[PDB]
Design a protein around this ligand. Sequence first.
Ligand code: BCL
Ligand code: BCL
Ligand code: BCL
Ligand SMILES: CC[C@H]1c2cc3[nH]c4c(c3C)C(=O)[C@H](C(=O)OC)c4c3nc(cc4[nH]c(cc(n2)[C@@H]1C)c(C(C)=O)c4C)[C@@H](C)[C@@H]3CCC(=O)OC/C=C(\C)CCC[C@@H](C)CCC[C@@H](C)CCCC(C)C
Ligand SMILES: CC[C@H]1c2cc3[nH]c4c(c3C)C(=O)[C@H](C(=O)OC)c4c3nc(cc4[nH]c(cc(n2)[C@@H]1C)c(C(C)=O)c4C)[C@@H](C)[C@@H]3CCC(=O)OC/C=C(\C)CCC[C@@H](C)CCC[C@@H](C)CCCC(C)C
Ligand SMILES: COC(C)(C)C/C=C/C(C)=C/C=C/C(C)=C/C=C/C(C)=C\C=C\C=C(C)\C=C\C=C(/C)CC/C=C(\C)CCC=C(C)C
Ligand SMILES: CCCCCCCCCCCC[N+](C)(C)[O-]
Ligand SMILES: CCCCCCCCCCCC[N+](C)(C)[O-]
Ligand SMILES: [Fe+2]
Lengths: 281, 301, 238
Amino acid sequence: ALLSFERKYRVPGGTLVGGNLFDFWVGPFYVGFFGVATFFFAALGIILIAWSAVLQGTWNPQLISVYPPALEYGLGGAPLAKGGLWQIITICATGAFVSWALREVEICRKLGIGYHIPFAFAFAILAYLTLVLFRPVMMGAWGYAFPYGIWTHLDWVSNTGYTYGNFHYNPAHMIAISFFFTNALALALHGALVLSAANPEKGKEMRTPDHENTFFRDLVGYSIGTLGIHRLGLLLSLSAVFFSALCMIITGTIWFDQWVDWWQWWVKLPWWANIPGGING
Amino acid sequence: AEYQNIFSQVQVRGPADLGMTEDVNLANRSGVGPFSTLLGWFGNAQLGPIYLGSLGVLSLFSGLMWFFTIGIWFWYQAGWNPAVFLRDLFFFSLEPPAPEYGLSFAAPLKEGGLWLIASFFMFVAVWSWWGRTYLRAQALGMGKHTAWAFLSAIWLWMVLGFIRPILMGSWSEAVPYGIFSHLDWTNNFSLVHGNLFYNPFHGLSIAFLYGSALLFAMHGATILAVSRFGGERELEQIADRGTAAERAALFWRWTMGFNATMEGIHRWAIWMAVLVTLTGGIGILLSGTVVDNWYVWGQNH
Amino acid sequence: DLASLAIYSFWIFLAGLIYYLQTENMREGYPLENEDGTPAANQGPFPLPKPKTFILPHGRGTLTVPGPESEDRPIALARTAVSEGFPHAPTGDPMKDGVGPASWVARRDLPELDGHGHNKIKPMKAAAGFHVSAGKNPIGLPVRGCDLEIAGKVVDIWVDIPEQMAHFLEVELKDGSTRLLPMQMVKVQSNRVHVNALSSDLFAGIPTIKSPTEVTLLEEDKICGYVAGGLMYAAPKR
Ligand code: BCL
Ligand code: BCL
Ligand code: BCL
Ligand SMILES: CC[C@H]1c2cc3[nH]c4c(c3C)C(=O)[C@H](C(=O)OC)c4c3nc(cc4[nH]c(cc(n2)[C@@H]1C)c(C(C)=O)c4C)[C@@H](C)[C@@H]3CCC(=O)OC/C=C(\C)CCC[C@@H](C)CCC[C@@H](C)CCCC(C)C
Ligand SMILES: CC[C@H]1c2cc3[nH]c4c(c3C)C(=O)[C@H](C(=O)OC)c4c3nc(cc4[nH]c(cc(n2)[C@@H]1C)c(C(C)=O)c4C)[C@@H](C)[C@@H]3CCC(=O)OC/C=C(\C)CCC[C@@H](C)CCC[C@@H](C)CCCC(C)C
Ligand SMILES: COC(C)(C)C/C=C/C(C)=C/C=C/C(C)=C/C=C/C(C)=C\C=C\C=C(C)\C=C\C=C(/C)CC/C=C(\C)CCC=C(C)C
Ligand SMILES: CCCCCCCCCCCC[N+](C)(C)[O-]
Ligand SMILES: CCCCCCCCCCCC[N+](C)(C)[O-]
Ligand SMILES: [Fe+2]
């Protein structure tokens, strides 16, 4: 099936690999070389996971967990049931995410639009590879990565953070959380603005960008503008993930002590380190 | 090579836009503020004008009163020593009344009284500002979406410092006013309730937080991707679908099998964001009042 | 248990909300069609929402969606396979026929009006007080195509008054007439403006506007589509 205005866009071209070989759709889905690659990587990984489910002894979604090689294995390979499948599944996951991005690039080329979406998606992928690849490799072992399990990965988040006390004190974690909070704030506002204009009070006429600018100008003394808010949401989101990746890439590597104590560089500053009074004096 | 539209290549300026009048009392509208060429590379360069009726003045006054109530106490903690003020800036904290005082106001000023005062100013500041988001919308004839979404944020806030402390029977439950302490209160709250990761509402709240970042990244990027077809003019694309809106929808249909409309995407947007603090507020409200330990609660339900 | 009631209830709500959200987003492009233009058999588990009517300002009327869907324009494409799911080949010149990445929608042939009933986009020369405030001014710079040949010169910037944002670069061709070029499809450089999407010989093909001091929604679509379409169809010159 097609959307009423879709056919004029389903033309040949845009593919990065294989010419018109895989240039076709399956229902609403565009295929392409990378659509096939993705399916491959995804099918395998799902299968390899169902297999790990058998070796673990469970078919329950809440229980199936796939752990990386124990620390003792370092960055080498480990037996399938002992961290191998994880290692293989991670390969598939990466292969499927990167393939999904590339498929996107092709969709962009066929549609004549910018590459912003896959570019954005790339940040998520990079966050993922920071947790399962870059940080582990920098730390010396795959055991530092998180396990693939609905609840078991939350365990890893908790233990990993408490390994440094209150993870709240990680300075980069603070910035990251800001962007996430600000992004959610911005999204709530952006959606409410456009909607409050497209859907005015009963019987009235749709408002306009002028009204939108007017509303925020009246409310807080500033309007970023329709091109601006979209530039902002993107910026906030990506910045949020960039700092997430950064807050962890530095943890267990350049800083491995209690994050709270990191803040001592500031308090110990010569010109006030020894002054009495206050909390730290 | 190709331009991305992240920063403007060239800025243009014209007369200060004074905005739509509609049913707004221009007497309360201030004058235009300066123009920021800095802001201009990213978004609109014009600052102001801002509206400030009575409610506005009220809110700004309470707001500052709140902040100053906390700040004076911060100075007092530094012994009025500028050097100590700056170095221990994140360590100062204005704590609530000890449990002993329940929900009374007996507590001494240096022991919860100031907290209650500051909290009072903030209560007025926030609620008055909320009424402000509603009225500014009404004066322009617009929907009340903003005021409704803002209510969801107000909900978490209200629950954290007023509704929960009350049901709990004491102001000691409330959040202290401090950078680091408010973080400590947060960690402690989780430890004390069996770890919020076990709280189904904390988990949903997280899905929406991550969801808001995923969706805004998607949306923002999409609009920028079709800004070459004027996609950023969302209201008119809603009223007369253009090739921008169609390519936007088709990028996602082809990618994930389904898509949005130029108006609908904003409904997805407003809810994704709004549900962060909605589920969150419930999650916290139930903590200590109905569930003491989420791990435990989880074992049974 | 109260918490158990709340979480159970929320999921009920969330499911109904997603339902609602999915239906709201079906106010355009639906019902689904077969490549031949007829209603597809399978429409999915989601029904069409009850119509809603937007009251447009300045007497421009209303917009009711969902509503009868029609391209209201010829689509110069043809099936390349005997079954559904394959690319439809351009029967003529895709750039000129306006299909593929060069597609345009049949939008209203009126201009967009700001909240005050005035034209939202206007050439800068006709916008009182408007002027370049930062960054290199493109006006006067020669316009180079992906084929590295000059195809004209920038004679003005078309501005979005309400947003105070540059939208188009009006470029003058050797024949003396001008064309509009989307700000986002151009690279303003110190000694020129570069256009990757188009080769010199393709600028004349860019659709033209009827009135010199205003462009219409329908005209903007044909201009943006045509230029973007160049990324794929110009290739042989780039
Ligand atoms: C007790 C636990 C510690 C703690 C320990 C940690 C640790 C440890 C970590 C964080 C991380 C984060 N913390 Mg913390 N954190 C704490 C308290 C908090 C609080 C709070 C209110 O208290 C907040 C708001 C945060 C916020 C955050 C975020 C900034 C960040 C997670 C988002 C992210 O990076 O996503 C990045 C996005 C991804 C990783 C997703 C990638 C998506 C992939 C590419 C695609 C998936 C495709 C999929 C499989 C297909 C599915 C099928 C289809 C649906 C059909 N933390 C406490 C103090 N925190 C994380 C971080 O920085 O990570 C980098 C992290 O590792
Ligand atoms: C950077 C953050 C930490 C982390 C910290 C947390 C915390 C803390 C929480 C979660 C929660 C979730 N995490 Mg996690 N999580 C991490 C990395 C991941 C990765 C990955 C490839 O990197 C994935 C796929 C997930 C997936 C999930 C979801 C199961 C769940 C809520 C969805 C959400 O928030 O969506 C945002 C995105 C969307 C709404 C888009 C749709 C995404 C769908 C829902 C994801 C499907 C995942 C699927 C069930 C399992 C794989 C698919 C199969 C292979 C087919 N997490 C890293 C290690 N995660 C929440 C929960 O309830 O956990 C039990 C929660 O509280
Ligand atoms: C060790 C600490 C615990 C923990 C303890 C808590 C607690 C305790 C809470 C959360 C809450 C949240 N947690 Mg947690 N959380 C943990 C780990 C995590 C991780 C992670 C990867 O590990 C993540 C992603 C999260 C994520 C989240 C968010 C989904 C949620 C906050 C929503 C929000 O945006 O509020 C942002 C917004 C507000 C608080 C809105 C109120 C705004 C007010 C109305 C306006 C300000 C007005 C003011 C006067 C203006 C100020 C100045 C002017 C600008 C000048 N947590 C660990 C396990 N978390 C909150 C929640 O709802 O949980 C269910 C919560 O209460
Ligand atoms: C970079 C910033 C933010 C962002 C952006 C973003 N995400 C994106 C995009 C963009 C721009 C897309 O274009 C793409 C998309 O298609 O949107 C729907 C996507 C996407 N983000 C997704 C998820 C996602 N994004 C997240 C976060 C974020 N995405 C950030 C906040 C999160 C979290 C945890 O916060 C999740 C879960 C996917 C829905 C979708 C990409 C779909 C995709 O790659 O499909 C190919 C693969 C499969 C269908 C299956 C792979 C199965 C196995 C091979 C592996 C699984 C093993 C293991 C790694 C998972 C175990 C999970 C456990 C932890 C539970
Ligand atoms: C759905 C939930 C999300 C959300 C939504 C949301 N927030 C909102 C809204 C909405 C829909 C509004 O309409 C409202 C708004 O007006 O936005 C611009 C708001 C808002 N969200 C705010 C904050 C906020 N929202 C947050 C979160 C969230 N908001 C969620 C993610 C957070 C966090 C912790 O994540 C914060 C901190 C406020 C900015 C604003 C409501 C403003 C308000 O209540 O003001 C009352 C009081 C004052 C005037 C405060 C004064 C304090 C001063 C002392 C400051 C500085 C003084 C001094 C510096 C003066 C000198 C200046 C110098 C710098 C030169
Ligand atoms: C140096 O310069 C001078 C001006 C001194 C300025 C210095 C000021 C400084 C440094 C100020 C710093 C302020 C800070 C750090 C504030 C931080 C707040 C934080 C980190 C978190 C806030 C959480 C607060 C919540 C959740 C509050 C909720 C409040 C309510 C729900 C209202 C409660 C109201 C009550 C109890 C009043 C009771 C009264 C009645 C009967 C209605
Ligand atoms: C606009 C709403 C769409 C977002 C749907 C989010 C679904 C993620 C659900 C994951 C969390 C599940 N839970 C209860 C175990 O925490
Ligand atoms: C938990 C959220 C994950 C949802 C996964 C569902 C993805 C939906 C893909 C649906 C599009 C289907 N189709 C073919 C009929 O178009
Ligand atoms: Fe938008």
